[PDB]
């Protein structure tokens, strides 16, 4: 069981009797800590959902689809994840478009260490 | 699965067990193909068994 010092440190921002009354605050503190364990798990699900929505919106502006892009990347051996792709569509439109054109049309110029073999 | 339609416990919606959707039918078709494919492989193995069995290493057998 938490001590008085621990309980009131956790409950400093609660409302009414939940702030300074031990019996009321102790039950409020334990329920809140239970919410946090569930919250950290759900955070990982929600953020990935947001990345996909932004990627899909950018793809369709050019006439493409999210599912077509993911399949196309794996065929080209490109391993950029969804967090990076989402940021490219929002802040780097030109680089995001270049990735789409390579996947769809494959018209990029290859680079070799020895330019003139 | 539940087929019972009586009682206060609502295992199924009013009207009983609902029919399968198109996706559910496709899901069950692929589960059976995997089962049939496994049996086909075991037939190939039986028709191509070598005379002498291979010996495979295991650390636990080695110790004892």
């Amino acid at each position: 069981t938490f001590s008085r010092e621990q309980v009131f440190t956790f409950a400093k921002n609660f409302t009414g009797r939940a702030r300074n009354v031990y019996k009321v605050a102790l039950r409020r503190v334990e329920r809140g800590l239970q919410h946090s364990y569930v919250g950290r798990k759900e955070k990982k699900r929600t953020i990935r959902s947001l990345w996909i929505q932004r990627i899909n919106a950018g793809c369709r502006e050019h006439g493409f689809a999210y599912s077509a892009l993911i399949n196309g990347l794996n065929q080209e051996n490109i391993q950029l994840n969804r967090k990076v792709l989402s940021e490219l569509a929002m802040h780097e439109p030109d680089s995001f478009k270049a990735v789409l054109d390579q996947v769809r049309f494959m018209k990029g110029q290859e680079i070799y260490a020895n330019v003139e073999p | 699965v539940v087929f019972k339609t009586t009682g206060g416990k609502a295992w199924n919606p009013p009207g009983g067990l609902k029919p399968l959707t198109n996706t559910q039918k496709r899901s069950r078709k692929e589960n059976l193909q995997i089962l049939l494919r496994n049996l086909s492989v075991l037939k190939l193995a039986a028709e191509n068994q070598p005379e002498v069995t291979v010996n495979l290493f295991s650390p636990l057998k080695f110790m004892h």
């Binding site: 950018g58 502006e61 569509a89 929002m90 802040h91 780097e92 439109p93 030109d94 680089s95 | -």
Partner: protein, 121 residues
């Protein structure tokens, strides 16, 4: 260190001479105090002998943070563990958590943020 400038400003060692709880602190000072000073010329190190009940470490940072740490009944190896995290950190509070995106940037867009392709209103 921030832009090549160390953030820890001073480190104070408080202990007693005859107390049993300070036994580990005395061993650390005898064996490793001098090599520690040579490694950190930019740190002001102070030692205080008093009649207090337990030894303590006090860290002061250039940003105004104060972090007292109790080293009661600890060995030199355990003491060194606390010092490692104090010296190499900026002294932020124990309740602070870094941004969830794991990145802080002043120049977020090189090519420009996406904008609608049409006449806005």
């Amino acid at each position: 260190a921030k832009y090549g400038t160390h953030m820890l400003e001073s480190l104070v060692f408080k202990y007693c001479d005859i107390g049993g709880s300070s036994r580990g602190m005395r061993l650390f000072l005898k064996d490793y105090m001098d090599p520690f000073k040579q490694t950190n010329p930019q740190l002001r190190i102070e030692e205080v002998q008093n009649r207090r009940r337990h030894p303590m470490l006090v860290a002061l940072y250039r940003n105004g943070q104060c972090k007292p740490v109790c080293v009661r009944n600890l060995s030199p190896e355990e003491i060194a563990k606390h010092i490692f995290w104090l010296r190499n950190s900026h002294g932020r509070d124990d309740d602070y958590k870094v941004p969830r995106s794991h990145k802080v940037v002043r120049n977020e867009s090189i090519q420009g943020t996406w904008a609608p392709q049409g006449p806005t209103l």
